[PDB]
């Protein structure tokens, strides 16, 4: 279990936002 | 190029943020 909040989520984490955060 | 910010990062956002945020 855990295997993409801490690898896949954070990266997108700090990106994805600048995505929909920002967009 | 796109489609796992806006299409699965927001999910984790919620959740992996609630993941390595707790802890």
């Keep these: 279990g855990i295997g993409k ?3 896949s989520a954070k ?3 700090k990106a994805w ?3 929909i955060m920002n967009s």
């Design 11 to 13: 990266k997108f984490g």
């Design 5 to 7: 909040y801490l690898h």
């Design 17 to 19: 936002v600048g995505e």
